[PDB]
Every structure is written in C-alpha cells, then in structure tokens.
Amino acid sequence: LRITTRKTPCGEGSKTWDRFQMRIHKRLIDLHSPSEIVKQITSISIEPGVEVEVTIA
Amino acid sequence: GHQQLYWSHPRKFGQGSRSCRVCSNRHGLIRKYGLNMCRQCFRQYAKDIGFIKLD
Amino acid sequence: MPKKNRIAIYELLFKEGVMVAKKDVHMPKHPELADKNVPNLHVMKAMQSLKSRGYVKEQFAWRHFYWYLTNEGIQYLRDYLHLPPEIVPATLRRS
Amino acid sequence: GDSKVSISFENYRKVHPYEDSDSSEDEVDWQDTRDDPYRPAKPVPTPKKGFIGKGKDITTKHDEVVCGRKNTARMENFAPEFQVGDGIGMDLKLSNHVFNALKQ
Amino acid sequence: VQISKKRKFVADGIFKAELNEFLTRELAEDGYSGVEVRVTPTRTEIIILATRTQNVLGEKGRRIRELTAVVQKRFGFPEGSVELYAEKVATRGLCAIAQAESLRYKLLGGLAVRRACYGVLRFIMESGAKGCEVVVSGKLRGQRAKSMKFVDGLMIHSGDPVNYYVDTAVRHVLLRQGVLGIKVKIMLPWDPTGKIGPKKPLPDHVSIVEPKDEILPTTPISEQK
C-alpha cells in the first residue's frame, strides 16, 4: 500500500515527498481434520498483531 | 434557513460531500483505500495507523 | 424545538450515562434515537444547554461530541422524569 | 564506558542462575509524588516583624540558606539563552554577590 | 460479504487512532500512556496503559464505565464486545509518551519552564536511559520566541536505530501567553526485554568476549576416562 504525499503542509518548499508504505503478507495453511481440532489449535496460541481467518468447507 | 430549502442541494456528488474525518477540511483529501483523511493530518497519524517509511 | 424531542432525548440519558453526536446540522436525524424522528441539531444544542449548567462534561474528538453525567446531574433528571430514587443508572449496577 | 568497540567479560562470570534478582529492580518513582524537589514551596506571606519563631531557632528574614535557595529559584526565571544546570537537584546556596553578577 | 483486506487494515488503524486521540484528550491530566488492542472474537480487549490506575478507574470504578459505553455507542460494534483494562506502565520514567504529558501538566500548573524541565530531565536520566533530550519552544521570556534545549547522555539522530530506540513525543501546552511545544526524545537502552529495552543492540556496537585462560602444554598426558 503505497501513498505518496507532500511533506510541506503549505506547499512552499522544494517539492519533497514522503512515500509511506504498508506491507501486507498473506499466508495460506491447509488442514484436513474435524473442526473441533482446528479450534483448540487456534484458540491457545493467540498472539496480538497476527489475525486468523477460518473458512469451513 | 427555511426547512425545505436549507439542504435542498443533494450532497452525494461533488467534493463538498467529502470532508476529512479529523479536521473537517476538504482540500487535500486521501480517498485511496478509504482513508478519507486530510493530506496534512495524514503525516500526524501515519505512524499510529501502521505506516512505515521504509524506503 | 418541541418538548417531545426534549423528553425523548432525556429518557436515553439517565439509563446509560453516555450519548454522542456527529456534529452535522444538516443531518436528518440521530441514529441512536431510532423511530423517534429527532434531528441531531436539536440533540446537540439541547444537550449543550446542560453544558453551561454544569451537569455534563464535554470531550471532543474527531467530529463526535462525548459526554458524561455529573453526580449533581443525576438528580437533575430524577425530577424532570420524576424517577423515584430506588432505581439506579448504569453507573451503580456492576461490581 | 561508552565505546562502540567494547569488551565482554562473560567467561569470567561464574554463577548466574537467577539474573533478575529483586535487588537492582527498585521502582524509583518520585515525580508525581510530593517528594520531588522540583516543586514550588507555596510561599508564606511576608512576616511584618521580620522573623519566624523565637529563642535559638529563630529563622530570620534573609537567612543565608533560605536566601540562597530563593536566588537559585530567581535564576530559574532568566533569559532563554542562559544556561543554569541542575541547581535545584543539588542544593545550591547562591549569594547576591554572585547572583547579581549573573543577573547583570 | 466483508470489507476488503486493504480497507480492512486501513480501517483497523483508524480505529486505533481515534481511540488513542480520545484517551489522550481525556486523561492528559491522569498519566495515560497508551492503548494495546488485542482482538478476540468473544470480546475485544483494550488495555489502557496509564501511570496511576486509581485515577482512571476513579472511586468504585465509575470512570471506565463511561469510557467503555462511549466506545460501545460510537464505533458501531455491538455491546458486550469490548473490555477495558487499566494497567500500570512497566517503567514509567522510560516511556516518553507518559513522561511528555507530565511536563505539560507541570507547565500548566504554573511552574517556571526551566525548573520543571530539569525535574523531568533528571527523573528520566535516573530512570535508566542512555540519553535523552527535551526541547521546549515558544514565548518563554518575551514576545520574541527563543528556543530552549537540554541535552545530556547519548543520542542517535539518524539510521534505522532512530525508529526503535528514541521515543519522540511532541505535545502542545497552552499558557496565558500562548502555545509552547515540548519534545522529549528518550533513547531506550540494551539488556533485552525483561520489560525494559529492545532486543537487538545498536547496529554498530561490537562486544568481544575475553577467552577462557586455557592450560598451556607442558607434558603430553594421556588420561583414560
């Protein structure tokens, strides 16, 4: 996610720009098991800043 | 003003229906990715939102 | 502003102690007062009428007024709606 | 003490099972309390008789210690280009012969 | 149908910005440090970091109730899904976000600028930092706006280290004459995080372990073990 912006909040300077970036990494991990196991695996190792999406069938 | 004629102009099309969610100013708005933030209040909250000037 | 809106706003105030706005005069109505047809301009100004009376505190952040109830403001709604004192607001229920 | 290229004495360290012992982990917090020296004295109105107390513990008007602390506090209201130091953290009894020169 | 991942992560950081701004607005005079939002589908737990937790809790725990109900009513997500938890900072002096709001209150209380700046300065120098600086700018002693600068210890002004060692925190204080700006740059130390300091050292310091003094050869000895 790349957003370029002017540094100057009035537009008087030497036309200097900030290239702000967000980097999003995506992971896909697949299992083949009944749905009660994936819940107890996911729910224990909860870590902030990393989030989990669970799709069933 | 009069009730029937105070907001009689529709406010869906035109940049006057779009204001920054921080400073309510409408010049220099970043609508990319749905920030809707002013370009001058963006440099204030860039570090807090999760933006890093890597390169 | 009519008194129907004045009573409709005051009913929500005591049971929770929290109430917000969007600072939009041309807003048609306030979303919290659902099925009441109370425009938010009347809400924000009639609520501001209690700011100068010392019953509430302002805390403004990003186009949204935020308010609390003073201990002296609790009794100001107990005689307008004539709420008898054995009922408590949202502050005194848990813990 | 502050060099980048540094030496490590790890091999000479003998025994360290519990490194985070609760002796060096003292929580030093004195700012928001009333124990910080960097706080106003809440000044008393000026006595008319010129002294406080009686007997041998009569604290007089100028009272060189008190007047020195007062002159330090009056230094704290100087020009922004002036540099003072840490004159309240260390007890600085500064006299008028010196303070008036610095004020000039 | 849900929000796209780009706008999912943009709108997540804006929620972390408005809440932080509001908590600063309210608890500027309470020692508020920061916000840690941990997202749990049952209830999202917002841990507030403050200096004195009894002030933000208040008597009986009444102040945080208004806060959690306001954030219930404002951000649209349903009630029974947010849990506020006020907690003390691991090191109050070392965190410059909580510290820079203390000097603002000290100036607002009527102190002379230089004395309170030395108070904050020596408190955070004794707190354990390798170096710190405070820059207060404005109309200090006149209609002419001079600048005041207190530097001691070390500082790293350039290089990736300036992203995770110094803790820049700018604040505005409102006096009778006008507005004074306060910058407090506290550099974090080494000794990896037992609640203090980042893990990796400064990307220049090399420390060399002295050798174990080995046995010099005297006689070829064959010992069966």
Place this chain on the structure above:
RNA sequence: AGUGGAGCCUGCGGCUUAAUUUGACUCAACACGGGAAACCUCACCCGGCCCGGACACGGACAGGAUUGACAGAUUGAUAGCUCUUUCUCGAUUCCGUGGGUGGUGGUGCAUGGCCGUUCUUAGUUGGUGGAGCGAUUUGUCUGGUUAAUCCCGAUAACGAACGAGACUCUGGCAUGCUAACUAGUUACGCGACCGGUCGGCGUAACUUCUUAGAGGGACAAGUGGCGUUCAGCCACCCGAGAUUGAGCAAUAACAGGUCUGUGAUGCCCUUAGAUGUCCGGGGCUGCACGCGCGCUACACUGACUGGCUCAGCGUGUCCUACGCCGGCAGGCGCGGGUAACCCGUUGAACCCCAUUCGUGAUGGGGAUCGGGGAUUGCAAUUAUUCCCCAUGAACGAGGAAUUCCCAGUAAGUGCGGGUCAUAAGCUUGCGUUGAUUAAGUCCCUGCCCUUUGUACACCGCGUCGCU
C-alpha cells in the same frame, strides 16, 4: 536532449470587472498552496433565509408566551420571507441587561507543530592530562590518505561521543533449503488437427520457471605495479555482482512558508439588516501586453493502412468479462470479482514486415470555426468530457541567453495511481526501445579550506540680508 523562434495548456503579473478570493516574487515564488473550481468548494461580488444567542438577572406570558400553516397578492423558489385569510402549538419561550459561541476574518515581524534553506554538506562537543595569572591553547596535526576530522604516522597528549560510516528498503545471484487446487512445468491418458501443435481437458509427481521466508554471497578478497613500501591509488584473473538507487540524516542558525490543515493557538475584530450558517446566480477561466514550466510539430530516420508481436508497478464494491443493437461515442441483458481466485496469459505503445505517399506549407502539423450524436450530473449558458464530417492557419530547426544529464543513464515510447459524479497537456511511479562523449579541470559561477595581517587615521562645502 533541448528551452528561448511558432500554436496550445497552465501559473504569475499588469488592463478591465460588481468581483475577476487568496499567499508565495534570484536559486530558497510562478502545472506551487494534492489549488485539474458547473453548485458546493469559496474565502469574493450581487440579493435573500435562519438563530443554529449556551448560561445568569429584570420585564412580558396561561384570560396565551409561541411555533407551523392550506388558498390568493408578492416571490426564481408547496421561500408564513411579509399582507389578506384565522386555523394550529401548551411554555419547548420572547424582549434588554450582562457574555458566550461561530468565523477560510487581522497579525508566520506574538506562537507551537510541520516543512523548506545554509547542507546532503563537513564539521560539532565534552572527560582526564600538559602550557599560561588569565583571556586562551594542545588534543582538533608537518606530511600523506579518502565520498568523508574516513584513515595512517608524527606527536603533551590519551581516549571518547554526535555527524559521515554502520543501519533499513529495493536490485542483480543461489538448478542448495522451505512448499503451493487461489502458481507453474513434466509425464501419462483423453481428445482435436496435419511423428509435430494445442492457454484444451484431468490426475501422478515436482519447485527449474512464479511466488516469499530463512540462510548463504563481496571483503580492495587474490595477483602485478604505485606508495613517506603505512594509510591507501591504477591494472588483471575468478566471480552474478571488484558493486546500484533511495530512506534516515549532526552543532549552530533564517524575522523563509503556513493563523488559509486542525475542536492548535495568544491579543484581538464582529456577533442578529452578523466578517456566523444556508440558499440562488455570477466570478475565480474575464484580455491590448509581459514573464516561467509543459505539450505538439516543422516532415522521408517520416505519414497512412493492413498484418505481426512482447511488460511492469498497480488500483478495483466500484472493477469489469461475455452475449445482443448501433458507424463511433454509447445502450440492453446475464455473469464474476470485497480479489495471484474475476477483469488478465494484463494479445500496451515505440519497434518488426508489406502497400501508398516522394521535398510540395505537401496527405507534414492540426491552432481556429460550423453542424450533428452520446454519456456523467439538480444544473455542461463560459464550447465538462467523448464521437462523426468540414475548415485547414502560423510553423520550413529558431537571435542574445539559458536548463538538465555518465550507463538500463540521457532521450524516444506508452501503462498505473493521486485529483475524479464528469475528467490529465500536471505530477507520483512503472516497464519498453535504447544512445553520444568524458572519466578531467578551476576557464565561468557557486561553495569551501589553509596561511598572513587583523576588534572608517589624514590632506584635497560657501556669498549677502534685517530684527
């Protein structure tokens, strides 16, 4: 390669205008204020609407304080805006005294923050020790060395810290590792066509191609010269690379820009025929003329047409595929995609082959102008755009002067994003094609740096007049 010579766009001046808001004026303003403005924007002008005047005092008010209002008159306006019409509404108030709010209203020479500039430099500063009463000095150099006060070595100095460097992101390399039905190949089978082709179909592997994480790799490493034979400098082997491009950027500063980005802001001005809010219209774009970027060209190394054939950032709940009607612009239906799943194997342009045009202001080049068509929008009048005929003008390489650039560079060429209801001649990025010269200097200019002297001296403004 241009610019300055033409045409056009845009910005700044002047000239007009009711207003043609506004700031910025060598580099360090002039396609800048994300400032490509139908309303809004909008500050400006011409006119209306409302209190959205909190709170305190006094007066009015229930035998009404009032609000809203159909029909007609007025009115651009189902503008009770006012009059007639008399219906509503139950203190939600009104009138003055106080002072609060709202200001894109004044001061960037009262300010914060941010940004720009000196400077993308080459410095800045302690501790201990030596000298001097002290100001002060050595350290911070004779010399050599480098992009670097970067380093060597002398040495009353020894050691440091900030800056530079290190760092972080990106690029070139891994047939070693990790593992892919939301990526790809091979094999087999199924076909389809004439042992070859299939982006045409499915399961076995598999990670070379594609992804993106760890680890590795490059250090003046090795060799030959130069060297105060130290520090390091030229040349060569091997290697993917003997090395790219950015981010961050010290001490000390500037009356540099911003109150017009903020519910940042001190003194304020105004506050009910308002400098507050909203609405209608206009204007910011108006044109004798001047000054800066930028875009098209001046034709043959070209233009037209047909055919051929390759990307990369990177958006998208609006992006769009496919089918049908239309000459285009467009319109209809049915789909997918909240996303390496769909648009898309992103059949992009320049370029490659063939035809025609052959030095002609020529078919080069399309400024100006008429007519029609479609879309977006309440509203295209000041042509918003896009499409089709027609009109075809200056311009034939540009005076003085001037800008930028060393290798996937300059130039040529198109794609994406920002602005966007409608939109790029701007700008931020991205690939594609791909050079010439030099690898050296103070000749211009600018900035340094060392030494020596060093804290506006003198000779060359008058005549007359009365009290």
